[PDB]
Structure formats: structure tokens, C-alpha cells
Ligand SMILES: NC(=O)c1ccc[n+]([C@@H]2O[C@H](COP(=O)([O-])OP(=O)(O)OC[C@H]3O[C@@H](n4cnc5c(N)ncnc54)[C@H](OP(=O)(O)O)[C@@H]3O)[C@@H](O)[C@H]2O)c1
Ligand SMILES: NC(=O)c1ccc[n+]([C@@H]2O[C@H](COP(=O)([O-])OP(=O)(O)OC[C@H]3O[C@@H](n4cnc5c(N)ncnc54)[C@H](OP(=O)(O)O)[C@@H]3O)[C@@H](O)[C@H]2O)c1
């Protein structure tokens with residue numbers, strides 16, 4: 176079950192989410208990625224940001240080496256972090272990711288965020304410690320550098336993440352554009368279903384990839400603990416009962432049936448193996464309209480901190 | 491079961507595909523071509539590109555020598571590789587093919603691809619960066635040189651491969667045209683059935699010859715491994731069950747009943763002998779419409795570098 180991307184490549188519609196907070200030992204990423212592959216996940220989502228590309232890659236390489244999978248069966252995503260937006264930093268950042276994971280190519284490379292951050296090396300030992308420094312980069316030139324990565328065979332497909340419609344149009348309207356982004360990976364779930372942005376993406380042949388599809392990890396560092404817990408929704412629970420599934424499985428299936436490619440992070444063996452059951456059942460059209468009704472414009476990514484960045488996607 | 495070509499020659503409607511990847515020992519092509527002829531294949535498709543003309547030729551000569559066939563019962567195709575498009579290179583390339591095969595004439599010589607490549611001795615000439623080097627040739631002059639090869643009795647018939655409608659018209663409308671292409675050998679299967687091109691070809695008396703009719707060899711170099719596997723299609727499988735045949739046989743029969751000449755590669759003795767069974771059954775008109783419904787405009791062969799060639803046939 177794969178979707179055809181606008182560059183002709185194919186992306187599995189269910190992806191494994193690998194991010195876990197820095198308290199979680201990195202050896203866990205190695206363990207759980209092997210478990211994900213053993214359960215049937217083939218699309219694996221990582222990033223320079225996650226500090227896990229080595230462990231994730233070693234999982235992949237391990238399952239390739241022992242003959243459970245071929246490299247060609249695995250669809251591996253990495254992402255260009257925001258301190259590397261300047262065009263001359265793009266290819267080395269990809270190369271660094273490739274060396275960490277010990278892969279020859281990534282199946283997909285994304286611009287992680289339109290919110291560029293100061294690159295390079297400070298120069299004093301402490302002056303800038305702790306601060307968050309924004310940078311200003313024309314993301315079109317970032318995108319050209321991405322296009323060159325694809326032409327070098329380093330990334331099979333290239334795309335973006337956390338872009339809004341305006342930011343997508345800026346790439347789409349670039350003079351001399353060679354490759355459209357294949358996807359826009361954004362927060363998407365029944366509390367923030369992104370239907371308008373989805374319609375836009377579909378009209379341009381860009382796949383929407385949903386993160387926090389199960390309602391986020393609710394990380395204390397950001398997420399308001401009084402925000403409603405997605406998987407406790409009564410409509411999601413009643414559909415789970417009706418179908419003899421679970422609220423997670425309902426929420427994942429919802430995305431698949433609206434043409435969205437869905438990620439699901441779990442570091443728990445049983446939930447990982449549950450999540451692959453998404454292909455065993457289907458929601459009715461009426462079920463789908465009921466889930467559409469749950470939208471409350473709720474972003475679990477309380478980016479509030481970054482709200483004054485000129486490229487903040489919700490300004 | 492032959493079709494009358496527009497030059498008066500006859501082409502068998504089922505052809506044996508001889509390409510195998512370079513990991514396959516070169517001796518196999520000799521073995522499998524003999525097996526193909528023993529099974530009933532009479533049309534045999536090779537090319538300079540395949541690096542097997544000696545072995546394929548030996549097979550053909552063997553079966554002629556031992557009396558299983560006469561030379562005139564065999565239809566042998568070779569192809570002019572893209573580094574040899576320049577008019578003065580066309581006849582020596584054909585002569586080199588003929589000397590390798592140890593044959594005096596080919597039944598058919600094709601321009602392999604409209605995508606001309608830098609002349610020389612590499613098959614895939616590459617620049618400093620590893621990028622393939624294109625050439626620019628007026629393919630009308632290539633065609634004139636092909637016309638001369640037919641007049642010299644070195645090729646009984648001439649045609650083209652991987653041409654689109656525009657590229658065909660260019661030849662058809664050439665001033666002083668002597669011979670129309672007898673055929674256009676193109677990627678064609680239920681996921682990319684080419685009906686519009688086929689209608690055009692039929693209106694001009696040009697036979698469409700299908701390659702990757704069984705969904706290609708899915709070579710990593712050119713095919714996305716997560717593309718759908720044609721012979722696993724549930725409609726093909728259900729028709730196979732209905733007819734007590736196989737999905738390969740359904741896919742081959744489809745082509746024959748729409749007036750398409752169809753190639754089938756196999757290096758496996760039992761699949762080779764299965765493939766000749768295509769003449770034992772027939773699909774209903776409803777079966778044919780059901781297969782027509784599978785079209786998803788999917789060409790298995792892809793290349794970022796070749797996509798940017800001015801003569802790329804899918805642009
Ligand atoms: N592009 C971006 O900027 C961006 C942002 C956020 C996320 N992402 C990507 O998207 C991935 C997923 O998003 P996310 O990390 O917010 O998490 P998510 O997929 O919404 O999952 C949230 C929580 O659901 C739990 N869970 C998983 N399967 C379950 C089931 N079947 N039943 C009940 N609970 C279940 C997990 O807990 P356990 O681990 O305990 O099972 C997990 O922490 C990330 O890991 C990352 O790859 C990208
Ligand atoms: N003009 C061009 O540019 C061009 C391009 C591509 C191909 N071609 C020509 O067309 C030929 C055929 O196309 P192709 O090589 O892409 O392969 P194909 O005919 O689409 O066959 C694909 C695969 O199907 C398998 N197969 C054959 N019979 C089968 C059966 N009865 N059941 C299940 N599987 C079966 C074969 O594997 P096994 O060998 O293991 O049986 C083969 O590798 C080539 O050999 C070449 O002559 C030309």
C-alpha cells in the first residue's frame with residue numbers, strides 16, 4: 176500500500192515515527208525500529224533533529240543484513256534541520272545524515288521547518304548560550320540545493336514539512352523550478368484535520384503526511400496537559416467499538432481514507448504491532464464525516480515560542 | 491500467428507525477450523533462447539545494449555542447423571544503440587551486431603530510443619560528475635541511414651522504439667520518406683496500456699510492440715521497488731482463476747486481442763513454456779474492458795537524468 180509521488184517514486188502510506196524525548200536511551204530507538212520492521216512497517220521517519228539516525232539506521236541495516244528485508248523494501252526519511260537552510264550547507268547536512276545512518280541514499284529528504292535558524296559556529300565561548308537565534312534565508316535557494324541532492328542520487332525524493340500554503344506557493348512559483356516538493360509533512364489528526372491545506376496539496380499533486388496523528392506524545396516541555404486527549408474522544412471510542420478496533424486504529428484509518436499518508440510513533444511492542452492492523456478494516460463514508468466533525472483547530476505543537484519568526488507558519 | 495507489416499514482411503505476434511541483468515552469467519542466454527525456440531517462440535528480441543547477441547545468435551543457428559526451424563521461420567530483432575544515432579554510425583553498428591550474432595541479416599532493426607547519447611565506445615557515456623552525456627541528432631537522418639540498411643538487405647524491416655506520437659509524425663512527415671517504421675516498440679501493459687498511441691499507430695499501419703508486458707524485471711536501477719507489481723493485480727489474478735490460466739498469460743493475451751505484438755522475457759524453462767500457451771484461450775470483450783480499466787499511466791522505467799533529455803518521450 177503505497178502512493179505514487181509527483182516524481183514517480185512510491186511512498187508507503189503507513190510510516191513509523193521514530194522521535195522520542197532525550198530522556199529515552201537511544202538504544203531504545205534501535206530496539207523499537209527493529210520491532211517496527213518485524214511488524215511490517217516499511218516507511219521509517221527520522222531527522223537530524225531526533226539524534227537517532229545512527230540507531231535507526233543500524234536497525235534498518237540489521238534487518239537488511241539478516242535477510243528480513245532488502246534495502247529497496249525500506250522507505251527512509253530524513254530531514255534538513257533549520258540551522259542548515261543556507262544553500263551551501265544543505266548537501267553536507269544530507270551527507271552527514273547518510274553517514275550516520277550508513278545509507279547510500281535517503282528515500283526522502285525534507286526541509287524540516289520553514290523557520291530558519293542561525294547557522295555555523297559562534298566564536299565566543301558563551302555569549303549566545305541558550306538564546307535561539309533566527310536566520311533569514313530565501314527558501315527557494317534551499318530548495319535548489321535540495322534539487323541538486325536529488326540529481327546527485329542522494330535523495331530519491333525531496334519535500335517539505337511544516338509549510339503553510341503561502342510557503343508552498345513560493346516554491347511552486349520559483350523561476351526554473353525543477354522538482355515540486357513530493358509532500359508536506361504537517362500536524363494532522365481529527366482535532367486539526369487540515370482539510371483546507373489538504374485540498375490545496377491534492378490540487379498540486381503534493382501528498383500530505385500526517386504527524387501527531389495519534390494526538391502527539393503530549394511532551395510536558397510544550398504540550399498543555401489540559402488540552403483534550405485525542406484518543407479519549409467519545410466519537411473515536413464509539414467507532415472503535417463498532418469496528419472492534421481501537422481509537423488509534425480509527426484515527427490512523429481516517430487519514431489513509433482521505434488520501435493522507437500517516438505516521439505513527441510507538442516505542443511499545445504491542446502498540447507497534449497493533450498499528451499495522453490499519454489495513455484490515457475500513458471506515459464507512461458516514462464514519463468519515465463523523466470524524467471530520469471533531470476538528471477543533473487544536474495544535475499540539477504549541478510553537479508560541481517561535482511565533483515572532485517571520486516564517487512562522489501560523490502567523 | 492503473424493501480423494502483416496507495412497513493408498509486406500510478417501512478424502510473429504509473440505516475441506521472446508532476451509535481456510537479463512549482468513549478474514546473470516552470459517552463457518544462460520544461449521540456453522534459454524534454445525528453450526524458447528523449442529517451446530514455440532519464433533520472434534526473438536535482442537539489442538546491442540543487451541551484450542548477448544553472440545549467445546542469442548548461436549541459439550538461433552543451432553536450431554536452424556539441427557532442422558527444428560529454417561532461418562526464414564525466425565524473426566530476429568536487434569537495435570541501434572543511442573550512441574550510434576549519427577547517420578554515418580548506423581550501418582557499421584548494424585554490421586557489428588550481425589557479426590556478433592553471426593547472422594547475415596536481422597528481420598528487424600530498431601532505433602532503440604529517441605534519446606541520443608554522445609558517440610564513442612561506452613554505452614552510457616558519463617561526464618566528470620558521473621552524469622550521462624547527451625547528443626543532439628536529427629532523427630530523420632538516422633532514419634535515412636536505416637532506410638539504406640534495409641535497401642542493402644541488412645535488415646528486412648526497420649522501425650523504432652520508445653518514440654511518442656510527435657516523434658513518429660516527424661518521421662512520417664519527412665520529405666522523401668522511403669519506408670515508414672513498421673513498428674514502435676514501447677512500454678505497454680495493463681498499468682500503461684498506451685490506447686491513444688495504439689490508435690495512432692493503427693491509423694498509420696504501424697504495429698505497436700509491447701515491452702515490460704509482464705510488468706518489467708523491476709531492476710532497481712530503473713524501477714521503483716514499491717511500484718505495484720503488475721502480476722499481483724487482483725483483476726489479473728481473478729481473470730487467471732476464471733480462465734484457469736495465470737496472470738502472465740492474461741496480460742499477454744490482452745495485448746494480442748488489441749492488435750499489439752507482445753514480448754515476454756523469461757529465463758526459466760517452465761515460464762518460457764507457459765508463455766506460449768497464450769494462443770490456447772481467449773478473453774471475452776468484458777474481460778478486455780476490465781483489463782482496460784487498470785490503466786494508471788504508470789511507466790515502470792524512470793530516470794531523473796533521462797527525464798531532462800529533449801527527446802524524452804514521456805515529457
Ligand atoms: N515534521 C515534524 O516537524 C514532526 C513533528 C512531530 C512529529 N513528527 C514525526 O511524526 C512521528 C509521530 O508523531 P508524534 O511523535 O507526535 O506521535 P504520534 O504518532 O501521535 O503518537 C503519540 C503517542 O501515541 C502512542 N501510541 C502509538 N500507537 C498507539 C496505539 N495503537 N494505541 C494507543 N496509543 C498509541 C505512542 O506511545 P508509545 O510510544 O507509548 O506507544 C505515542 O507517543 C514522530 O515520531 C516523527 O517521526 C514530525
Ligand atoms: N525497447 C526497449 O527499450 C525495451 C525495454 C525493455 C524491455 N525490452 C524488451 O522486452 C523484453 C521483455 O520485457 P522485460 O524484460 O521488461 O520483462 P517482461 O517480459 O515484462 O517480464 C518480467 C518478468 O516476468 C517474469 N515472467 C515471465 N513469464 C512469467 C510467468 N509466466 N509468470 C510469472 N512471471 C513471469 C520474468 O522472470 P523470469 O525470467 O524469472 O521468468 C521477467 O523477468 C526484454 O527482454 C527486451 O527484449 C525492450
Ligand SMILES: CCCCCCCCOC(=O)c1cc(O)c(O)c(O)c1
Nearest residue numbers: 194196222224287288307394397480
Ligand atoms: C524552545 C524551543 C524548542 C525547539 C525544539 C523543537 C520542539 C519540539 O521538538 C520535538 O519534540 C519535535 C519532534 C518531532 O518529531 C519533530 O519533527 C519536531 O519538529 C519537533
